[PDB]
Design a protein around this ligand. Structure first.
Ligand code: RBR
Lengths: 218, 223
């Protein structure tokens, strides 16, 4: 079988800059007819792969003229001339010169953009959840850049530890931001023993930490 | 509209079998070979095989020759993949993809893909989610916009899907990656931002599916 190798990461790029993604095969993909049987796909977050290039350098249907391909028998390059927001995702090369078809491990592309502060939003637990004996408090950081952020929970001004979990979206394909959820989980008993619930966020887009809070039952 | 549509996510026990479907519409099913691809995190993509739906003959990656069995039903325009003697290594997203060929340049490639099917192989029992509102309030407004959402708690296995207003609301939606809780169950939130002006007259419902447990729920989210 042919082994196809790519780099895991591409050095992030700013909108309008060029980028170059490489792929290599353990055997030549140049056939006797002079054509090279290498395809490029882009998989956007949550979606199926979509064809970009076939025969090493032909653009498929509806593929931006910013994409182009080249290479030898065994070394290949996908070139994005003027990168845009919607290019974000994982790029895969695939050889189809022989069965079995084989793919590279994929190259994630992230885009760099201007620093952007999170909008911070806080959500008390639902009465419905409380009835069942747990409280989940949710803090949302919407549409920020870069991805690094710190979210600390304070209950009646005590810093919380070990009772929260975070999750972050992949880079948005229109505005190149991230969003992040922080969920604090308490028993109904513990929730009802305290008053002030606060989410404190530190981020480079913020002069100083923003705190969003509520009082239980307000 | 040429499209491929795959069966929903499944849980199966070690040693059992599953049969995944791929319905083709918008073209003559028998005209295009149907391929299947496996995807796991940090394992890239692996090619499984293809079937010629006109002839019924299928061809495999040697690695999958004992795992996968491809069939096709011409009357229902549906391709099937059976996965046998399941193990934890079979937990993955599986795609179908159609092959096209262009006689004018000799090019061939996968032009249309299914949306994928998640398979989890585990001895643990399924559990459908509890769905709670993330209610819009003054604590979730900014400008003349408000955030609201649904908390989708305590399910197994992955995945859930979340739509808003049956797919009419897509702009501003962020459905977060699931997190594994200490309990061994998953949880996620889906959020959206809307006009604060709209909170009095516009209904917001999250439509939550958990195909592995064969469950669905709608949750109205009120201020
Ligand atoms: C090794 C030699 C084979 N090569 C090619 C040659 C390719 C064939 C060329 C002619 C095509 C006619 C047919 O109508 C096509 N349709 C059938 C219905 O479904 C949609 C597509 C597929 C078709 C049979 C191609 C399938 C893939 C074939 C075997 C390719 O081989 C592989 C491994 O993919 C590889 C390099 C170039 C020659």
């Amino acid at each position: 079988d042919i082994v196809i190798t790519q780099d895991e990461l591409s050095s992030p790029v700013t909108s309008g800059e060029s980028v170059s993604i490489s792929c290599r095969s353990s055997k030549s993909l140049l056939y006797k007819d002079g054509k090279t049987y290498l395809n490029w796909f882009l998989q956007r977050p949550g979606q199926s792969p979509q064809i970009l290039i076939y025969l090493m350098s032909t653009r498929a249907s509806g593929v931006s003229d910013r994409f182009s391909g080249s290479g030898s028998g065994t070394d290949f390059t996908l070139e994005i001339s003027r990168v845009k927001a919607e290019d974000v995702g994982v790029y895969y090369c695939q050889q189809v010169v022989e069965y079995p078809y084989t793919f590279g491990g994929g190259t994630k592309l992230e885009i760099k953009r201007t620093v952007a502060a999170p909008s911070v939003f806080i959500f008390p637990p639902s009465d419905e959840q409380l009835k069942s004996g747990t409280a989940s408090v949710v803090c949302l950081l919407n549409n920020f850049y870069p991805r690094e952020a710190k979210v600390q929970w304070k209950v009646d001004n005590a810093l919380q530890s070990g009772n929260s979990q975070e999750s972050v979206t992949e880079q948005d394909s229109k505005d190149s931001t991230y969003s992040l959820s922080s969920t604090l989980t308490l028993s109904k008993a513990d929730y009802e023993k305290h008053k002030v619930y606060a989410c404190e966020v530190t981020h480079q887009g913020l002069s100083s930490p923003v705190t969003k809070s509520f009082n239980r039952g307000e | 509209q040429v499209q491929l549509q795959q069966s929903g996510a499944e849980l199966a026990k070690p040693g059992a079998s599953v049969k995944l479907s791929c319905k083709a519409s918008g073209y003559t099913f028998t005209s295009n070979w149907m391929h299947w691809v496996k995807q796991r995190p940090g394992q890239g993509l692996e090619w499984i095989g293809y079937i010629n739906p006109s002839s019924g003959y299928s061809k495999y990656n040697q690695k999958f020759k004992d795992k996968a069995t491809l069939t096709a039903d011409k009357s229902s325009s549906t391709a099937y993949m059976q996965l046998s003697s399941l193990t934890y290594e079979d937990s993955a997203v599986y795609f179908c993809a159609r092959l096209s060929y262009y006689d004018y340049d000799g090019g061939y490639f996968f032009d249309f893909w299914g949306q994928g099917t998640t398979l989890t192989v585990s001895s643990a029992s399924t559990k459908g989610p509890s769905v709670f509102p993330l209610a819009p309030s003054s604590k979730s407004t900014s400008g003349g916009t408000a955030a609201l959402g649904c908390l989708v708690k305590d399910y197994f296995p992955e995945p859930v899907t979340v739509s808003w207003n049956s797919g009419a609301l897509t702009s501003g939606v962020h459905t977060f990656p699931a997190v594994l809780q200490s309990s061994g169950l998953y949880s996620l939130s889906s959020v959206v931002t809307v006009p604060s002006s709209s909170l009095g007259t516009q209904t917001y419902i999250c439509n939550v599916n958990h195909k592995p447990s064969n469950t669905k729920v709608d949750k109205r989210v009120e201020p």
